[PDB]
Amino acid sequence: PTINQLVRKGREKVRKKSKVPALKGAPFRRGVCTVVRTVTPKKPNSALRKVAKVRLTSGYEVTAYIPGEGHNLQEHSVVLIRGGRVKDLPGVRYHIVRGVYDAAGVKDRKKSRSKYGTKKPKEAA
Amino acid sequence: MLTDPIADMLTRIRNATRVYKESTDVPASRFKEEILRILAREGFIKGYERVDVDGKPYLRVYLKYGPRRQGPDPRPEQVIHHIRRISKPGRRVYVGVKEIPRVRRGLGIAILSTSKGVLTDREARKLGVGGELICEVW
RNA sequence: UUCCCGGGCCUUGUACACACCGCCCGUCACGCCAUGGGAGCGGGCUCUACCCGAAGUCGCCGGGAGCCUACGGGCAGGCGCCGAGGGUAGGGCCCGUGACUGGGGCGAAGUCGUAACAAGGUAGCUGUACCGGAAGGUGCGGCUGGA
RNA sequence: AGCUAGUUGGUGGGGUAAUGGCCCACCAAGGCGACGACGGGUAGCCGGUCUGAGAGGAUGGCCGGCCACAGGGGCACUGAGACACGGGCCCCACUCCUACGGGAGGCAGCAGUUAGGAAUCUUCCGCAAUGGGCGCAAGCCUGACGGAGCGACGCCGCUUGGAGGAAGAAGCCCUUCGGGGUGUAAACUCCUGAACCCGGGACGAAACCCCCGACGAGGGGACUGACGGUACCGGGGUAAUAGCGCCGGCCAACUCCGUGCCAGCAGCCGCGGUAAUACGGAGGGCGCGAGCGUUACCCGGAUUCACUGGGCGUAAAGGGCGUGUAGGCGGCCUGGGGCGUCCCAUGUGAAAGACCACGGCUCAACCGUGGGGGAGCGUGGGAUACGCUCAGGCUAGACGGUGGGAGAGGGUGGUGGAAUUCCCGGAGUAGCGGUGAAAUGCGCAGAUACCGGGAGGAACGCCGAUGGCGAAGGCAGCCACCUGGUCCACCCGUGACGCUGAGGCGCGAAAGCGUGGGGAGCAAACCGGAUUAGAUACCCGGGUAGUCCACGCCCUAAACGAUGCGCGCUAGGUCUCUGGGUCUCCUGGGGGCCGAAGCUAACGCGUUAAGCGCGCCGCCUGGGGAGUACGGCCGCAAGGC
Ligand SMILES: [Mg+2]
Ligand SMILES: [Mg+2]
Ligand SMILES: [Mg+2]
Ligand SMILES: [Mg+2]
Ligand SMILES: [Mg+2]
Ligand SMILES: [Mg+2]
Ligand SMILES: [Mg+2]
Ligand SMILES: [Mg+2]
Ligand SMILES: [Mg+2]
Ligand SMILES: [Mg+2]
Ligand SMILES: [Mg+2]
Ligand SMILES: [Mg+2]
Ligand SMILES: [Mg+2]
Ligand SMILES: [Mg+2]
Ligand SMILES: [Mg+2]
Ligand SMILES: [Mg+2]
Ligand SMILES: [Mg+2]
Ligand SMILES: [Mg+2]
Ligand SMILES: [Mg+2]
Ligand SMILES: [Mg+2]
Ligand SMILES: [Mg+2]
Ligand SMILES: [Mg+2]
Ligand SMILES: [Mg+2]
Ligand SMILES: [Mg+2]
Ligand SMILES: [Mg+2]
Ligand SMILES: [Mg+2]
Ligand SMILES: [Mg+2]
Ligand SMILES: [Mg+2]
Ligand SMILES: [Mg+2]
Ligand SMILES: [Mg+2]
Ligand SMILES: [Mg+2]
Ligand SMILES: [Mg+2]
Ligand SMILES: [Mg+2]
Ligand SMILES: [Mg+2]
Ligand SMILES: [Mg+2]
Ligand SMILES: [Mg+2]
Ligand SMILES: [Mg+2]
Ligand SMILES: [Mg+2]
Ligand SMILES: [Mg+2]
Question: Which experimental method was this entry solved with?
Answer: X-ray
Q: Does A2 touch chain B (CB under 8 A)?
A: yes
- Chain B residues contacting A via beta carbons under 8 Å: 90-91
A3 vs B contacts (CB less than 8 Å): 90-91
Tell me the three-class secondary structure of B72-93, residue by residue: CCCCCCECCCCEEECCCCCCCC
Compute the half-sphere exposure of residue B127: CA atoms within 13 Å on the CB side of its CA: 16
The interface residues of chain A toward chain B in range 18-77, judged by CB-CB distance below 8 A, are none
Which domain CATH number covers A17?
A: 2.40.50.140
Q: List Cβ neighbours of A27 (8 Å cut-off, separation of 6 or more).
A: A83
Q: How far does the CA of residue B91 sit from the closest CA of chain A (Å)?
A: 7
CA–CA distance, B111 with B99 (Å, rounded to integer) = 14
Pick the CATH number of B81-138 from 1.10.287.70, 3.40.50.300, 3.30.565.10, 3.30.1490.10: 3.30.1490.10
Residues in chain A: 125
Q: List Cβ neighbours of A94 (8 Å cut-off, separation of 6 or more).
A: A20, A22, A54, A62, A63, A64, A65, A81, A82, A83, A84, A85
Count how many domains chain A has. 1
Can you spell out the DSSP letters for B49-63? -EEEETTEEEEEEEE
Alpha-carbon distances of B138 from A64, B1, B40, rounded to whole Å: 63, 28, 13
Nucleotide with smallest C1' distance to residue A46 CA: D261
- How many Å lie between the centroid of ligand 18 and the Cα of residue A114? 21
Nucleotide with smallest C1' distance to residue A42 CA: C107
Do the bridges between strand A96-97 and strand A29-39 make them parallel or antiparallel, or are there none, so unpaired?
A: unpaired
Radius of gyration of chain A (CA): 20
Pick the CATH number of B3-80 from 3.10.20.30, 3.90.580.10, 1.10.10.350, 3.30.1370.30: 3.30.1370.30
